Structures are given as C-alpha cells and as structure tokens.
Design a protein around this ligand. Structure first.
Ligand SMILES: Nc1nc2c(ncn2[C@H]2C[C@H](O)[C@@H](COP(=O)(O)NP(=O)(O)OP(=O)(O)O)O2)c(=O)[nH]1
Ligand SMILES: [Ca+2]
Ligand SMILES: [K+]
Length: 430
DNA sequence: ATTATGACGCT
DNA sequence: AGCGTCAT
C-alpha cells in the first residue's frame, strides 16, 4: 500500500548508437551513406565476419556474426567496410576514438556509465529536478519530444507510424499532472526532453544518430531503448510495465538471455517476465539464489536498484586474437611473435590511455585457449605490469604460460594455441 | 573457422 | 586469484 516502494525514485536513460561501426565508416566515406552496408573483420575466410549492419541491410536479413559471402547471397549490392588491420590483427582504434567523442558529449548533461563501446547509462534524476524548477509548472509541449515514443500508447479509441507516435504522445501529455513536481511520470517526461537535447547534440556534433530509452532504472531503460530503433527514443513508465511484461519473453531482459533465463523458464514452467509476479521472493531465491531471486522478484514488477556508476572510461584495456583450426600456433617462435604483436598494440593503447586519463595499469592478465577446449579461456594467469614496454610484457606473458606447453621438444607447442589475450587491469591514478 | 573485447559474479 | 556467465 502506502509503504510498497515502486522503484520510481530515479530517472535513468540508456543511449545506444545505431549500427555504430557502420555509422563511423559512413561518416568517413559518404559513398556508404543511406545504403545497405556492413562492417567486416578480415576477408580471406568466407569474406570476413560481419560485426555491424546498417538498417537498410538488415531489411535483407543481414546480421551480425554472418559471413560476408553469405550476407552477399542475401543482399548482392551490400557494401562492406573492413576493420583496420595492424600487426597482423584487427585494430579497433577508430571506433574507440569515435566512442570517446560521443561519451564526452553525453557527459556534459550528466554523469554516465560506459556500458560498452557505444552505449551509456545516464542518471538524469538531478537534471530533471533542475529543469522542473525552470519550467515553473509550465506544461510540456509535444514539440519538445519530436522523436519520443510512449510505450503502450495510444490505447482505446491512424494509418502511418509517425501518426501513431504522435497520438500516443498526445494521450500521454494530456494525462500529465504538471502541477505535482514529484510525479514520476512528469519526471520521466522531463528526462525524455533532456534526452532529446542530448541526442540532438550528439548528432549535431558528431553526425551519429542514436536511440535511447528513458525509464526509472537501467534494465527498463535498456529494454525501452530497443523498442523503436533506429534514431528514436522510448519512454517506459512504471505504469506501462504490466502490459509490456505480460508478453515479454524472459530472455529479452539483460542478464536472462543465457543459462539462468533458461533455468527460470524450465524450473518455473513460464515464458514471459510478467508470469514471475506470481512467485514469492523466497520461492525465487530458493530456485535462483539470494541475489538473483531478490532481483527477479523486483524486476518483474519493474523495480531495479543497480546504480548508474560514474565511470566514463573502460576498466580494462585488452588485446586478443583467435587462431582457428589450422592457423593455430604450434611453435615457440610463433607464440612469441604473436604475444609480441599483441603486446605492441597493448603498449600503444596503454601509453595513450596514460596520457589522456592520468592513470596506469598495474596487472597484466594473460589468457589462452588450447586446441580442443570449447571454453573461451583455457587458462588465465596474472603477473605484475610495472612498465609500459611491449617486449617486457610479451616476455612476462610467455613466462606465465610456457608451462602449458605439453611438448617435450621445447621448439614445438602442443596442444597448439587457438587464442591469445593480453589484458591490462587494476588501474591507479598517476 | 561468429571475433575482439568488456563487464561482473562465484568461490 | 582463477574460472564462469553474459553480452554482442
Ligand atoms: N569486434 C567486435 N565488435 C563487435 C561485435 N559485436 C558488435 N561489435 C561492435 C560493432 C557494433 O557497431 C558496436 C556496438 O555494438 P551493438 O550496439 O550491439 N550493435 P550496433 O551498434 O551495430 O547496432 P544497433 O543499432 O542494433 O545498436 O560493437 C563483435 O562480436 N566483435
Ligand atoms: Ca548500438
Ligand atoms: K550497444
């Protein structure tokens, strides 16, 4: 009743760049703009692997993880841009730099959490309080929300999608109580005004378009962001959650797309998020553990407490390369040469990070996969990272992995290595 | 032979 | 500390 907290205390947005790597390449090369196009890494094996797809190309069925040769079967006029290669490997520097552009613009409006190379959470609670004091109880015009969808509207008592969007927005706005400066729906609406401004700034100052979700927590903001891509933003109110969740497959919610979500489905015999409401918190905890159970109990009611961390920079800086099938590394010289290539990219990125961001990594994590192991990592060993020197780092990585070499002959490497991964972690201010 | 990462939980 | 999960 009056004591049942509703998780409406914060305004949180999730901003995600549309087809990011594609937009980066389309900005650089105007010939790619407004075309079916994709970004690929490598080329020799089946045309390279696609990692980003323009919405025009998505209409033909082109997806991430598909081989370019197969994508061209679906879309023969598909245009392709390849990731840069340096020291024998993919080099994603261009996209990391573009990410910094976007992240710095977002940081002007509020503290952000960098969730991935092209998406960030935004805690707008305080900014919304400020804008509400400025408005002085003035209603919010639809002209202030020109790309916003209100999830679940229109409802009740009309042919084209922009007309739909506007009807829903008008129903939402006419129902607003702009008198109460503590109304959560009003707070979300003002948050959406601010996100319109942030998205306008990103597009004006970088050329990049993005989608966004506005809700009361990170999971709902993320789900909202996905509802109307590309180049649009969606407000998911607390009140919209029962209908939204009533037909939402469990796997669509961030963190439930894997084994845990499959176990929720199998153990409880349910399919949709909303079905979780019928279980007690203790029941959920008994199946899925304390933390998961409390989280599911709150989440299926639209409530989640995970804070937006004030973290604009990545916590780790890593370099990895797969050596699949017959390219696997089977000689000591091979393993040393590739460890050195990775360590050289790592040194470059670390040196630039230290100059930009006034910090130094102190731990080097070395991960490998051996042939036949289906796991991502077959082995992970750490050592100290005392100097940004590639030869040092690569020699140290070899020292921590060399006992994995089954071969008695210290010139061969068996079983051959199908992945190498160097990761700098545990940063300290410098 | 979806690849190159990046986050975070568990013990 | 090393491993597993999730993500994409
Ligand atoms: N190296 C690599 N990069 C990847 C991979 N997957 C994605 N990226 C890169 C390429 C992506 O551009 C970028 C951001 O990932 P998303 O947000 O998941 N996809 P996008 O922004 O393209 O589409 P949407 O409009 O649906 O948000 O990360 C991968 O497996 N490997
Ligand atoms: Ca994106
Ligand atoms: K993303």
């Amino acid at each position: 009743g009056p004591h049942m907290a509703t998780g409406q205390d914060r305004v949180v947005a999730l901003v995600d760049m549309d087809c990011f790597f594609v937009q980066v390449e389309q900005r650089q090369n105007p010939h790619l703009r407004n075309k079916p196009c994709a970004v690929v890494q490598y080329k020799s094996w089946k045309g390279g692997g696609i990692i980003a797809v323009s919405y025009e190309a998505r209409a033909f069925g082109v997806t991430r993880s598909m081989w370019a040769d197969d994508a061209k079967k679906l879309c023969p006029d598909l245009l392709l841009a390849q990731v840069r290669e340096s020291r024998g490997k993919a080099n994603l520097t261009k996209y990391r730099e573009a990410s910094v552009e976007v992240m710095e613009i977002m940081s002007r409006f509020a503290v952000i959490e960098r969730a991935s190379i092209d998406e960030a959470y935004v805690d707008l609670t305080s900014a919304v309080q400020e804008r509400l004091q400025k408005l002085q109880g003035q209603p919010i015009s639809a002209d202030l929300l020109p790309s916003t969808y209100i999830e679940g509207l229109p409802q009740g008592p009309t042919v084209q999608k922009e007309g739909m969007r506007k009807q829903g927005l008008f129903q939402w706005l006419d129902s607003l109580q702009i008198d109460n400066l503590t109304s959560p729906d009003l707070q979300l609406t003002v948050g959406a005004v601010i996100v319109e401004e942030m998205r306008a700034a990103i597009e004006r100052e970088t050329g990049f378009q993005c989608s966004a979700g506005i809700s009361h927590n990170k999971v709902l903001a993320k789900l909202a962001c996905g509802l109307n891509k590309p180049n649009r933003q969606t407000l998911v109110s607390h009140g919209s959650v029962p209908q939204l969740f009533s037909q939402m497959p469990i796997r669509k919610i961030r963190s439930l797309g894997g084994k845990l979500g499959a176990s929720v489905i199998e153990i409880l015999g349910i399919e949709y998020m909303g079905e979780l409401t019928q279980f007690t918190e203790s029941q959920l905890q008994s199946h899925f553990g304390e933390k998961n159970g409390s989280w599911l109990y709150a989440m299926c009611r639209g409530i989640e407490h995970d804070p937006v961390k004030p973290r604009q920079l990545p916590k780790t800086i890593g370099c990895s390369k797969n050596f699949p099938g017959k390219t696997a590394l089977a000689t000591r010289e091979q393993v040393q040469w590739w460890l050195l290539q990775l360590a050289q990219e790592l040194e470059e990125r670390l040196t630039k990070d230290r100059n930009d961001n006034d910090r130094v990594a102190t731990q080097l994590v070395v991960s490998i996969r051996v042939q036949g192991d289906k796991r991502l990592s077959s082995l992970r060993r750490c050592c100290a990272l005392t100097r940004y020197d590639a030869h040092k780092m690569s020699h140290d990585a070899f020292t921590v992995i060399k006992n994995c070499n089954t071969s008695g002959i210290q010139t061969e490497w068996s079983p051959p290595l199908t992945m190498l991964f160097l990761c700098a972690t545990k940063f300290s201010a410098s």
